[PDB]
Amino acid sequence: MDFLDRNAAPLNEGEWQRIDEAVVSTARRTLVARRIIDVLGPLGSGVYSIPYSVFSGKSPTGIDMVGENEEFVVEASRRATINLPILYKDFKIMWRDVEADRHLGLPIDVSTAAVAGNFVAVQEDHLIFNGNVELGHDGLFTVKDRQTVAISDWNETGAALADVVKAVGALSQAGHYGPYAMVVSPVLFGRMIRVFGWTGMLELDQVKALITGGVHYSNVIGGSKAVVVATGSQNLNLALGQDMVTAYMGPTSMNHVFRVLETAALLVRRPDAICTIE
Template sequence: MGAPILEADHPLSAEEWERLNSTVVRVAQRSLVARRFVDLYGPLGAGVQTVPYDEYTGVSPGALDLVGEQETQPVFTDIRRFRTVPLLYKDFLLHWRDIEAARTHKLPLDVSAAAGAASFCAQKEDELVFYGDTKLGFEGIFNTPGRLISPLSDWATPGNGFANVIDATERLQRSGHLGPYAMVLAPRLFASLHRVYEKTGVLEIETLRQLIVGGIFQSSLLRGDVAAVVSTGPENLDIAVALDMSVAYLGPQRMNHPFRVLEAALPRIKHPDSICTIERAPAA
């Protein structure tokens, strides 16, 4: 799971270390939202510090010909940059007395602190994918330049949420992005879709799932009433992972044992127009 250097000289037994790591992985898998619809590129290795960040434009179709002589526009990089893969991390502490007590009484080691750190680290990854980081100059799904925008209507009115999502998919289709689509939205909007759609006897969200086959997900990290419909696939966006979520030992400190949950990852948006956000129009 992690690089050997991360595991050097830790005070835990093999069983305790495995329990710690498996807890971190389990909590991360349960907590991460963006990874459920964004492809991963990697893991590339803990020492990888930069990755190419390519952007593409144009969606001309492939050719059909009997002998392969018809010209076709190749897929190529319009913009290539190299970006540093940032570290995302959260520290936690295991007290030496807790370790000794678990061993003395033959109890499983309590790794609640590790679970909490993994949850915070997962939230940071989702925040990076959704909003990037202004200080480091990274863009996310909801603020990348060139994305499509569908004005948010009042989802308190039955049918408006469905109509908004349909409008977003139509905008994506006009840009040449035909899916499969996934959607992430704020919890309040997610709850608004759990109403019967017109006279069908079916919830709005169930009707939408026939169109948004990549999944409909909610995230409490979204800022305000917003949603995003994404044409998924590594040709449009992915997460470059150098080091997947791992645990590192930081060395003894006042007899106690600090650890770090960390990863190295960077979202790469290759086709900004494969994203359509649903958000309020800015005030005039």
């Protein structure tokens, strides 16, 4: 790739490999979304926007000895599009540190790069779960055609699992069978662990019996909310564009400035595959 300046920067490849590995490992620790949602692509830098089909419709399946009928085509209810924003954050490596590593072997303070990776990963999760207003990206909690279950007072024992039962009910009614996965705001997650009092196991361990794709939490989700997702590329994807990468911006003052950038966007291919308990 051309845009990614990696030759006017002073740093060796033995520095770049450390920095990129520190970014990748910090992302893979930090992220929730790439657990519940699959990566699509990555596609490279150059894709500004992606055309994507919306199915959002329930229709039968063919069952015959020779299958004459052609009623049974999957229909794109609308073939919409979305634009891929850049998420980025910037960090400085001091010229002193570079010259130190280039003579004394004292290793770069790549904790800067790790902190940038963490912050962009947090912004990726915030984009995906919460959406964004100014970009016009609907997120999992915002897309209008999602299922909705009026959340009960999860201070009462089993009400949380009863609401999960409702939500997987609603998903099954729309013909989204499992495997389901769920993500919970930690305010509710504590209530699934404890706030009911005690039970012979956590109500979390009860939910794990039904929601076999996993239960997760993220402080990114404000309020008392949970999203249940019929997982896999059939229903959702994260389309990367350019996967989280570290770019030289050039210097400011003598100090080198580097950028972490990523272009991921949420392809809500099947809004009927989402239920929010809220």
